[PDB]
């Protein structure tokens, strides 16, 4: 057999860390001439649970989709490595600097659009996929400005009408109302999710922030609190944001419908 | 617990044509290009030559390499479905009205590079790959600008140092001079295929183009002909090209080195 995407801790050069997070650290390295980010592990079921989430990027091959290069299968320093985005996550890019003379209407529209496309990805794979987690954070920006979408840890496979498990995890600011009230949610979860980052692209705010998560689950989830949009905001934008924020799922657009509204808003 | 590469024919919606057959097509949302399987080729050889191509491509994960999205399996129309890369073949590009203008040395020089990432990664992979159809119509670029290399049909894993049984094939505007003659081929025979790449970016000229096969068989494969170098060339962009000229595939330098000449040179 061999499927080539396993890969030696040995022939890996590692570099300056660009992020951190629960599960491990994450660093740029060299590979072969190749520009690569490492996921490595704290050095547990989780070993099974490893495997999930690296068998699991293997069944993605879109290009709005974090590109998977192998992975590190050996203990004590398991990694998933895959591209390297040299412009980090989207939201410390929103917030940093300068981004209005950079960051333009017409290119953070365009952002949006890319991860619509790549969302539209995962609700069509056979089972569907369902992130769980859409931030602005896992949000990764390309050298060219192409955002491609990231971290699918939480990530877990929809084959039935609803979600399974009730691992019910992820970033509060973000999550729909239906999953901070932990009651069973679908792909449509995500659309909400994006609800909010259009928001953040189309605003240039921070969601909440003043709210901790306890707060957050409260008054989102439980009280019927929503993000505020400005009335200078553009209807067309103001109506795609609030149709991801339907209190009925279902009534939320599908990802491939969300292409066909924002499509026209580009130029 | 299953591919999730392979699709049926009628999930495809087939659009306009691209070259020959190809085709876009959107998928599932998705806009992929489709390599079609012609009727007259659905036989026991041919169709296992279809299935290396698809073992191949998934053994395949880089920036620099098209994206296999997935495979048809099914007939009629087994094909190769990837992500589509909307401004076309290199040689296209290269050869169209008001090219200079289009592009710039720099912008020239890094499409090289990219060629250069690509090739590096293939020959890096264990066991290595060997393109043997290296050559502008099989570079496609991306919508941003970025090249990335198609078409393994005759794509070969090298174990020996050698490719065992060497079949005759390619095209000879952009063959080594020992495969134009059927010998023993190896990764540097790509080496040169790149020279010949790099001399079309560095002059936008047609190589050869006034000799037909046969006559570039006997000047390059036999005669120790070689393209024209320009007076005004810049000397260390030649010195590139010169490198993977050399008659001793030995003498030409690895896709790695070749990027370390490039690099510099791109400012």
Same mark, same amino acid.
């Given at each position: 057999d061999g499927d080539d995407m396993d890969i030696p801790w040995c022939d890996l050069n590692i570099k300056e860390k660009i992020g951190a997070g629960s599960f491990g650290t994450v660093h740029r390295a060299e590979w072969h001439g190749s520009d690569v980010a490492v996921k490595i592990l704290m050095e547990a079921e989780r070993v099974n649970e490893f495997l999930r989430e690296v068998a699991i990027m293997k069944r993605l091959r879109h290009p709005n989709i974090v590109l998977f290069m192998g992975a590190v299968?050996?203990?004590?320093n398991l990694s998933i490595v895959t591209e390297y985005? +040299?412009?980090?996550?989207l939201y410390r890019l929103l917030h940093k600097?300068?981004?209005?003379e950079q960051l333009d209407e017409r290119r953070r529209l365009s952002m949006a659009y890319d991860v619509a496309k790549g969302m539209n990805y995962l609700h069509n794979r056979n089972p569907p996929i369902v992130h769980r987690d859409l931030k602005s954070p896992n949000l990764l920006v390309d050298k060219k400005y192409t955002v491609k979408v990231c971290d699918f840890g939480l990530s877990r496979l929809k084959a039935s009408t609803f979600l399974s498990?009730? +691992?019910?995890?992820?970033?509060p600011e973000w999550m729909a109302p239906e999953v901070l009230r932990d009651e069973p949610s679908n792909e449509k979860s995500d659309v909400y999710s994006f609800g909010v980052i259009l928001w953040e692209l189309a605003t240039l705010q921070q969601p909440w922030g003043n709210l901790n998560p306890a707060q957050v689950v409260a008054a989102?989830?439980?009280?019927?609190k929503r993000l505020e949009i400005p009335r200078n905001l553009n209807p067309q934008v103001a109506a795609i944001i609030e149709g991801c924020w339907?209190?009925?799922?279902?009534?939320r657009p599908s990802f491939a419908t969300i292409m066909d509204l924002l499509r026209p808003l580009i130029k």
């Open positions: 299968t050996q203990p004590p985005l +040299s412009r980090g996550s600097s300068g981004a209005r498990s009730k +691992s019910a995890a992820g970033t989102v989830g439980f009280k019927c339907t209190n009925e799922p279902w009534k």
